[PDB]
Amino acid sequence: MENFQKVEKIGEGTYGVVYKARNKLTGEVVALKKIRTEGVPSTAIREISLLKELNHPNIVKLLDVIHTENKLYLVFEFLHQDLKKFMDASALTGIPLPLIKSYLFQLLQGLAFCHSHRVLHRDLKPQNLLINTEGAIKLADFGLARAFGEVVTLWYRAPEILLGCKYYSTAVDIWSLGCIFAEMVTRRALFPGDSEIDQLFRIFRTLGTPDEVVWPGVTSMPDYKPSFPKWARQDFSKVVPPLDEDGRSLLSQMLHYDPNKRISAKAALAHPFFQDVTKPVPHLRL
C-alpha cells in the first residue's frame, strides 16, 4: 500500500508477485507478496494467519497477513537471494558439495518442522528457497496451496500429483526437495517437463514406468492410463554423477514412487549422508 516505498519487484510466485519494500515508517526492509486478468479469490485468511505462528530458523518468517482493497498481502522477512539465482550464479563452478549438503540438511530440518505441525508446502522450487550471507537457507510460502494453478513450473511436482491424486501428503515435499538436490549437484534440472504429460514421462524415462509392484494402487489413480509407455528404470549412477553413494542412496529414497515408501524429512536427517555435515558460508554476490 502507501505504507511502503516499494523498492522493486523481485519475482512472480505461482500464487502472486513479490516486492522488496521498505516500511516507510519503521525503515524495515521486507518482501511483500500480493495475492491475486484471472480473478481474486478468498476463503481462509484464518489458515494463512495461523502460519504467522510458525517459527523456525529454516522457514522464512511470515510477519503479517493483510486482507484489503480486494487483495491479500503477506509480509515476509527479506532474504537477499533465492536458490535459483544462486545456482545460476554458481553454474560455471558448481555449488561445493559441503554447501549443497548443508543446504539440503537445513531444508530437511525446515520440512521436518512444518510437517510435524501438519503444514505442507506443495509447491517447493528453487525460487521458493531463500539464502543469506551467513550460510542459512529457508523455505518460503508454506501452506499457501489452497487454490487452482510465466508458465507454472512443473519440474518439481511429485508423480502422485501428476497422476491426479486428490489427497497429497508430506511426501510431495520430499519429492520436490529431492529434485532440487539433484539439480544442485548436476547443475541441470532433473525433470524439466514442459507439459504435465511430458513431466510425467520424463520421470518415467528415468525412474522407470511405475507399476503395481513398486507402487501398489498406481494403476487405479485418476489419470493413470494403461497406455503409458513402459520404460525400464535407468541405472541411477547415471542420474546424479558424480554424487557419492551416500548421496545417491538418500536421493533414491526421496524419489521413491510410492509416497508411503518415500523417506520422511525426519528419517532423511538421520541418513549417513549427513554424518559429516557442516555449515559453510556461500560466496554471495548481492
Ligand SMILES: NNC(=O)c1n[nH]c2ccccc12
Ligand atoms: N530476493 N528476496 C526474495 O525474493 C524474498 N525474500 N523474502 C521472501 C519471502 C517470500 C518470497 C520471496 C522472498
